[PDB]
Write a protein that binds this ligand. Structure first.
Ligand SMILES: [Ca+2]
Ligand SMILES: [Mn+2]
Ligand SMILES: [Mn+2]
Length: 430
DNA sequence: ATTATGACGCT
DNA sequence: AGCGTCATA
């Protein structure tokens, strides 16, 4: 009872850009705004692979991973923007730089954890305490939450979406105890006021719209974010968790979308996150290991303690290229030329990184895939990274992989390489 | 022949 | 250290 921790100590948000690469291209090219459009890389093979899709195009059934020729079958008027190509490969610099724009704005409000190119977690606990004492016990107006959904509301004793949104918000605010500066629900609510402000600043200063989730931890914040996209934010309270989880497929929770989630379902004979509450912590630890068991036991009750890490910059800087089907690299000269292309982009990104961020990578990781191997990576070897020099980096990468060549004929490369990957790691301040 | 990434956990 | 898992545009 009185000693049962409820995982309500923190206010955590997850902010995630709507259709991000698409918005980046739409900002640049006004002709693409408010249209079914997608971002594609390469073109020769089946029109190129789609990697981002506007909400107008999703309405036609267009998705990520789709070939553009196939997408055009669903949506003949689909507009396309192509990822830049440099040194013979897709180059994602425009999107990385747009990401920095957004991350720097978010960082004005709080410490952030960069979680991907288009999203960050925010620990708003301190900021909330500040805003609360500023408010002086003043109630929170619905006007301060113009894009916020309260998950699970309205409930109990209008047929429009915005009307439903306002109805739930009214019920929520009607119920709040705004005179208790330690109420978790009030704290979340103030968190949501701050995220409205964060999201308004992002849109004002970049043109980009985003969604957000506000809860007590990262997993719930991430889940919440997706509940009402695009261009909206969702508050998931501790109290909303039982109903939310009662019909929530296990695979929807972050880290459970893969093999572990599949095993939870198979071994326990369940489908929904809520069904996990009926197992003891020891039971879950027996099936899924000590760490996962404890994590599952708390997570299904809406509790998780993973901190928002203070990290705005990526820990690694990498360059990779697949060489699929018949384009697999079969000659030493071929392997060396592409190692050089990768190494040249890597040097460019590393040099910019060193100037912007006062750090230097110290380790070069080289990874390849060989034709026929089921796995995404066949081999991963490291060597020292002592100078930002593309020719040296590619020569070194060749050295650490050159013995992988089955061929007695040195000029030939067998088995042919279906992937090359160069990654700079182990940064030190400089 | 989705591709190009990026973080973290295991042994 | 090298491998595997899970994730996102
Ligand atoms: Ca997104
Ligand atoms: Mn995202
Ligand atoms: Mn996505």
């Amino acid at each position: 009872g009185p000693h049962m921790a409820t995982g309500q100590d923190r206010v955590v948000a997850l902010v995630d850009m709507d259709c991000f690469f698409v918005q980046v291209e739409q900002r640049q090219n006004p002709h693409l705004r408010n249209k079914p459009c997608a971002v594609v890389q390469y073109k020769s093979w089946k029109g190129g692979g789609i990697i981002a899709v506007s909400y107008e195009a999703r309405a036609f059934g267009v998705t990520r991973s789709m070939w553009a020729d196939d997408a055009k079958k669903l949506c003949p008027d689909l507009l396309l923007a192509q990822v830049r190509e440099s040194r013979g490969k897709a180059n994602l610099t425009k999107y990385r730089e747009a990401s920095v724009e957004v991350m720097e704005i978010m960082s004005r409000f709080a410490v952030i954890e960069r979680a991907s190119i288009d999203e960050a977690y925010v620990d708003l606990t301190s900021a909330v305490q500040e805003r609360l004492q500023k408010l002086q016990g003043q109630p929170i107006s619905a006007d301060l939450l113009p894009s916020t959904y309260i998950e699970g509301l309205p409930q109990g004793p209008t047929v429009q979406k915005e009307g439903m949104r306002k109805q739930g918000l009214f019920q929520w605010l009607d119920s709040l105890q705004i005179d208790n500066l330690t109420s978790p629900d009030l704290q979340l609510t103030v968190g949501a006021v701050i995220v409205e402000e964060m999201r308004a600043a992002i849109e004002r200063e970049t043109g980009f719209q985003c969604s957000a989730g506000i809860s007590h931890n990262k997993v719930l914040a991430k889940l919440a974010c997706g509940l009402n996209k695009p261009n909206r934010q969702t508050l998931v309270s501790h109290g909303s968790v039982p109903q939310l989880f009662s019909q929530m497929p296990i695979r929807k929770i972050r880290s459970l979308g893969g093999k572990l989630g599949a095993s939870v379902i198979e071994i326990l004979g369940i489908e929904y996150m809520g069904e996990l509450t009926q197992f003891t912590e020891s039971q879950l630890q027996s099936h899924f290991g000590e760490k996962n068991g404890s994590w599952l036991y708390a997570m299904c009750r809406g509790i998780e303690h993973d901190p928002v890490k203070p990290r705005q910059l990526p820990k690694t800087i990498g360059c990779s290229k697949n060489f699929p089907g018949k384009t697999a690299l079969a000659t030493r000269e071929q392997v060396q030329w592409w190692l050089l292309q990768l190494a040249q982009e890597l040097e460019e990104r590393l040099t910019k990184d060193r100037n912007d961020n006062d750090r230097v990578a110290t380790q070069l990781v080289v990874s390849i895939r060989v034709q026929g191997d089921k796995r995404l990576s066949s081999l991963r070897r490291c060597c020292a990274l002592t100078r930002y020099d593309a020719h040296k980096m590619s020569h070194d990468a060749f050295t650490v992989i050159k013995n992988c060549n089955t061929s007695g004929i040195q000029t030939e490369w067998s088995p042919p390489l279906t992937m090359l990957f160069l990654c700079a790691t182990k940064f030190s301040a400089s």
